[model samples]
Target: GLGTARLQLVEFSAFVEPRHLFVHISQLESVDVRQIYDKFPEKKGGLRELYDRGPPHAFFLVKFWADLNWGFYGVSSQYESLEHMTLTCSSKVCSFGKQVVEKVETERAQLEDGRFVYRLLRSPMCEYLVNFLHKLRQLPERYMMNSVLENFTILQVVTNRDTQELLLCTAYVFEVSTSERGAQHHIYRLVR
Candidate 1:
């Protein structure tokens, strides 16, 4: 059986260049966190609570000009004291000359546990990708035990890049969990 793990990410500051404002807003507005929660209750409770709070400590704003498509900006003061942050931007479509954009700002706090845990609302796309990848792997079933380890490595590399870019900040939290074998181990060990 595949064991489960959890991670959270919170955003503090986010900025988007002018040309992608409208698309960003539309995508954000389209997200119904409550609807998402109603669909998947257990694995996604905190996120539902956050969304039901109406909005974060901050809200998004945009400016438009004839010279640029649109300029977008948003920030969260919820973790004003935290030294690090995570700003994530995603796109759903791309063309030679145009693109679609979506972004979320979060503040991250590390949890004290033997396994790594950070709190964020969670992303539907990331979840879907994990499931899709799991389904697509051709490796033997025994290798499935290492999927989290592989993701941890890949995410660490990407997170490091984003942190260096000043696009966002990151913290590593550790938690411990029991495997199907009923042995406890560090979260990273599972990944390793």
Candidate 2:
């Protein structure tokens, strides 16, 4: 009971470096928590029932990785390279998982060019989880029209479940990037 209670207070934040842009996708992984909840309602319960009520939902695991660089700048210029990136999936809105922030492991791959890559190597989802991995796509040139060179390529995740009632089962993602002053923020902490 106390364990789960403590986890609810667990929050996430990214490691930021001065001048470098910090960006993340909200709802990186969305799952139909109820799908698993319905399968396994409770294994342990008591006054704990009054709070948590049920065990944590089952997690479907997945991995995400990308090679990011300015599209106009071309593939030759590597902005960042994220190898074996990792992010968790849950009913929780798309945001950095505590696991990622807690470990804070970072390494610059020895690539020949200036490269930037971010990777979410492995993450959990429901058993019925279906992956909607999209291909490498760049941000609209118009979005970075002001700085033609800054039109960096980015990875995005979007999904549509046409056959079933997958209202909340699919994951969707988008990035928020800006300089120090124009920076935006999200409340990674959950309060109830």
Candidate 3:
């Protein structure tokens, strides 16, 4: 078996770089990490967990955005950091990188989609910060928290350029004591 599994990237989001797009596993409870492994059978033995809390969660990263409609998918089991992952995925070693260069190209529209979010989040002039918070309050009851100390959750703010809709990219958060112990392990912080 090729370990074939359907790609249901509903809650997952992509990172847009100048040379490539990187996708990582998020919202663990929503999807089986095993299915992601199935998507890349060759990386079966190569894949490993990044951290250990309870159930082993795979922080799998892959490059799937071909320059064109059907570029090959490249899986990487090792990365020094998120930045290193970007460098690794953009190099010739990444199967998808070659696919874009030799076989397919990044989908023009999708590339723009990733670029917009990428640029929007980093710039000081971002207009979506308030919009993201507003959307957060509108999430399902499960996402509601009495206080930040109750359950610190994370959700990416996705923009639908055409329709002007905002979406929560990753759907859940963790409620562990480890989360409370961290003083600097933050992914994103909100400022009033």
Best of the candidates, TM-score: 1
Regions of model 3 farther than 4 Å from truth: 1-149, 167-169, 175-192
As for TM-score, the candidate ahead, 2 or 3, is: 2
What tens-digit string does per-residue lDDT give for candidate 2 at 14-86?
Answer: 2212112222323223344332232221323111121243233211212112212220110111112222222
lDDT of 3: 0.22
Error of 2 at 84 (Å): 29
Between prediction 1 and prediction 2, the one with superior lDDT is 1
Model 1 residue-pair collision total: 25
* Model 1 lDDT per residue over 22-94, tens place: 1111102322223322222232222233234322322111211111111233222222112243433322211
Residue pairs with backbone overlap in model 3: 66-105, 66-106, 67-105, 67-106, 68-105, 68-106
lDDT of 1: 0.25
lDDT of 3 by residue, 59-125 (tens): 3222221111012223221111111011101111112111111111121122332232111122121
* TM-scores for every predicted model: 0.23, 0.21, 0.19
Runs in model 2 lying further than 4 Å from the true structure? 1-6, 9-11, 16-172, 187-192
Q: Is candidate 1 or candidate 2 better by TM-score?
A: 1
